[PDB]
Amino acid sequence: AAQTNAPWGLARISSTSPGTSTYYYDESAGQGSCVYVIDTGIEASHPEFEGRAQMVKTYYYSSRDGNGHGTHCAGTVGSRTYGVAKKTQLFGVKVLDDNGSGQYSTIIAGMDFVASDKNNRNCPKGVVASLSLGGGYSSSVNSAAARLQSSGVMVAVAAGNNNADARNYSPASEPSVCTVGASDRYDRRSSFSNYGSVLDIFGPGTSILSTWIGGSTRSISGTSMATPHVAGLAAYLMTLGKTTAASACRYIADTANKGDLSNIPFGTVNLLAYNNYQA
Numbered sequence: 168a169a170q171t172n173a174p175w176g177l178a179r180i181s182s183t184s185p186g187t188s189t190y191y192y193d194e195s196a197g198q199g200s201c202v203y204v205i206d207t208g209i210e211a212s213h214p215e216f217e218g219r220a221q222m223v224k225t226y227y228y229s230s231r232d233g234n235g236h237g238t239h240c241a242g243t244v245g246s247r248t249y250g251v252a253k254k255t256q257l258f259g260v261k262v263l264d265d266n267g268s269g270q271y272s273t274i275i276a277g278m279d280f281v282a283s284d285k286n287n288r289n290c291p292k293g294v295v296a297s298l299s300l301g302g303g304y305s306s307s308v309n310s311a312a313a314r315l316q317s318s319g320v321m322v323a324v325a326a327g328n329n330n331a332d333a334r335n336y337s338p339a340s341e342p343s344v345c346t347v348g349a350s351d352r353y354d355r356r357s358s359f360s361n362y363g364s365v366l367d368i369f370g371p372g373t374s375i376l377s378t379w380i381g382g383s384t385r386s387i388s389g390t391s392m393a394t395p396h397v398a399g400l401a402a403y404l405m406t407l408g409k410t411t412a413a414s415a416c417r418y419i420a421d422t423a424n425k426g427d428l429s430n431i432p433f434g435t436v437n438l439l440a441y442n443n444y445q446a
Contacts, residue, residue: 168191170192171188172189173188174376174377176243176372180371180442183441185353185354192251193407196254197253197403199290199292200290201257201285201289203285204237204240204257204299204395205262205278206236206237206240206297207263207265207267208230208231208238210231210238210381211257213238213380215250215384216242220245221259224284226261226269227264232380233265234380235379237263238378238380239377240377240395241257241395243392244295245402246378250377250399252400252406254406255406256288260280260281271302274308278296278311282318282320293411295321295401295402295412295415296398297323297394297395298394299325299390301325301337302336304335309337309340312338312344316344321345321402323344323397323398323416324346325346326347326360326365328359328389331362333362333363336361339365342365347366348362348393349369349373350371356429357372357390359388362432368419369438370400371392372393374386375388377392396440397419397440401415422441422443423439423440423441
């Protein structure tokens, strides 16, 4: 399948070169997989989700996304126009309030929730969790992300936006989950992106167009935006039977575009998510 005039990040993930604008993908499109977006929520009524999104949990007075960030990230995972895996089921878990904040105890509860909740969902092709959130190092936050992964969920997490080594942030610094840095449309490391040995992969993170609340759309930037490209890619590759939740981060690294990014610091991986789709 070919989507013309796609957001640049979608085009980049199915291309061997920057500077193209058509996104190419197998029509299976993550059908039969699920992705949890653990964030400020998801505006499930957005036409872009086509009925494939739903809120499954909140820790606050409402499951509504009153921010937009969770909706934007879900849209990069799975919206019809802005998404990587255009037929995945999206589940929203609102661990962050409408100011984008959340206590680590709530974040942890949300991760453990997803590890159990997948057993109440139909995801025969596999389950992914996208975590576009983070703060300072916490062994407890890392342990939670490690249990979620261990339970059979492909966990993708933001490296962080500090232009710093991600070893000092959580769940970024957890070795067993997929830690995602951000790039721009010219294959430069995004200027805010964290880096370091704990990074596993980069995805598109600067100037990313996706869904927003009030049935709208917006372009914003962050390792928050790179993470759901990877999450959507993993769901798409699991539906194709190419990988599994346990192996998807390795598989994405194995199949990435290599050595193509600039301003990657010595000792950080130079690997850009790529779907290796041959139309």
